[PDB]
Symmetry: C3
Subunit: 266 residues, 3 copies
């Protein structure tokens, strides 16, 4: 059933997606799921052992590799982590269903915790390029919603305070910030960046909030972690060259992947 055909039940496609994953990986259920965003592609390498790789295009509802990872905990029990292959942005024009399909598919596999990551611009000068930041809340500015009916979900604590405390048990120095989602793909003008600050954002980017909303609706607990690609337009007096942004991003690789691995164990 095509996800973009309005008559299709997106959750039925999620179910079929999960089933496909259960039999292609041999894992009956996953416990947590991760979405690797810009700057986070190598960040799942230290998480544990890869149990299976599933070309994403072969999973119902999508269209590079989805990974099933076994995570060893302190007490010897294990966890299965679903690492989603790639991510669909609103600016690709495929509709909001394709954007949150990965999240609904993860919840259908039985996952309870969702770790959303992204690359983004920061409005706070203390957080230079390469700095990871925990999301405390968000402002969705895309004028779009992933929910399609009379939906009763409370979004008072989208980003689980429980998980934010855990992250702080792992690294007490991570700051927290409100993230604003712009439709994109073009970046914000200095006036739009001042606008976001006046509205209460510390970070701007192009994803995550619709995924968080869909996660909550499916009852997932959410941990959001941004990597500041660099300071947003007009924030820095002397803005970083593109080469500099890339290098600062690279050099954050080890830290960032050690953080997800430690967090995945709790």
């Amino acid at each position: 059933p095509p996800l973009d055909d309005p008559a299709t039940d997106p959750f039925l496609v999620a179910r079929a997606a999960a089933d496909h994953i259960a039999q292609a990986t041999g894992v009956e259920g996953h416990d947590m799921a991760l979405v690797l965003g810009s700057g986070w592609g190598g960040a799942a390498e230290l998480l544990g052992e890869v149990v299976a790789e599933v070309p994403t295009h072969e999973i119902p509802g999508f269209s590079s590799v989805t990974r099933s990872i076994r995570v060893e905990r302190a007490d010897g029990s294990v966890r299965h982590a679903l690492v989603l292959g790639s991510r669909t942005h609103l600016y690709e024009g495929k509709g909001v269903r394709a954007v949150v399909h990965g999240v609904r598919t993860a919840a259908a596999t039985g996952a309870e915790t969702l770790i959303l990551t992204n690359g983004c611009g920061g409005l706070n000068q203390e957080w230079g390029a390469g700095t990871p930041v925990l999301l405390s809340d968000h402002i969705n500015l895309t004028a779009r919603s992933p929910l399609e009916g009379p939906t009763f979900v409370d979004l008072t604590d989208v980003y689980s305070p429980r998980l934010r405390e855990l992250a702080h048990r792992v690294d007490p120095t991570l700051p927290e910030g409100v993230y604003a989602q712009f439709p994109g793909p073009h970046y914000e003008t200095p006036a739009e960046v001042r606008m976001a600050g006046i509205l209460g954002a510390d970070l701007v980017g192009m994803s995550t909030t619709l995924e968080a909303i869909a996660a909550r609706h499916c009852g997932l607990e959410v941990l959001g972690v941004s990597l500041v690609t660099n300071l947003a337009a007009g924030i820095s007096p002397t803005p970083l060259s593109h080469a500099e942004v890339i290098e600062a991003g690279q050099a954050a690789g080890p830290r960032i992947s050690a953080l997800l691995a430690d967090i995945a164990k709790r």
Copy 2:
């Protein structure tokens, strides 16, 4: 002709809709129309004597009973109130046309007065669950408009001071506020609520402004009445539980319906 098809003239469907109503009800023209939002469902029981009921799905352009009520005034004169059967929200994705069809239809029956009610979240701590609030102005945050083409409607006084003054005759204590409309169906996070306050809203909800813009365009006089379902996210340190909100909503029922009934007679 399907309201859906871009070629179709929405106003001609509304014309057919009024003609059907006049014929099905026996009432050649209506004087006022009421749209009952969340929590206002039975608020039209004291309006007057039901003259007719029309299965809404049988009226051109719709797809629940629409009622024609005889309102009896002080000086024995009578008015006919059109109580529209259903309401189509923007978040259902049926297009902005289906959202304002009821308003354009009321205009075509010749009802010059439109009473728009809704349920919303309040930002003012003085207005707890159950408080009816008069709309003094609005902020449309849906990035949508019900008008197609070069239709330059002046929205300087969308909500008629004249009608607010009459509302104050029935209850001089009613407060007034600026309502902000988000696309929905989800509610706002505490950060979005704070943003709404910064922008100047006192109330947040998910309907009404598109309807109010189309009403003006048709030359209707509009009364907007919001029912605070409860304080919005992060406004109260002591949030009411879902059961309490429902209960508070039920208890306002009587007050609320006496209010419309009195306002309807003027």
Copy 3:
């Protein structure tokens, strides 16, 4: 290939448009392009000699005359200015592709400079109807983007400082301001206008920022100039009558056409 079909490549239609123009006008390439907004219809009559007029509906992708003008410079050299036909607005419902097609056609003829003009509402009382204002930056509030993929374009200086310097050589008294685009077609309510000032806007309208984004993606230097049609709702304690607004705009005609004529020669 209809621009309308998602499959069509917009830029290929732009190429066709441009080859068509070069042929119909005999001008191999143009150097600059101008879009005349509301209040600017007669402001290109002093630009230079009209080399050719092309009915717009005849150029690939459009659907009321486009003109190729010869600009004689001080040193005896010449330039060819492409003066675009009307302008397609977002509120017309034909999609973002149709809105920025003129800009991409211009780029395709080789133009390196784009002058965008519009008529807008002002929020600064020091700028009465008739005041032309240079655009220093903008705030796009339509929740749309003309870019279709990971088009990672920098908007840190959408409105060229070079061009604002030159405009200032012609008339050093021109002020600069931040422009906010609303989808329209309805005008803003006094609450919405207050909202725009809180967000940092000095001017509100319904066009331009999408065209500006598409122009910068194509590498054009952009000059934006607004003509305040009048004060936005609630700004003026004393609202101008229609007669006044119209007369203020006509009184501005000479000043505006002289401005572009002088700028066009640099």
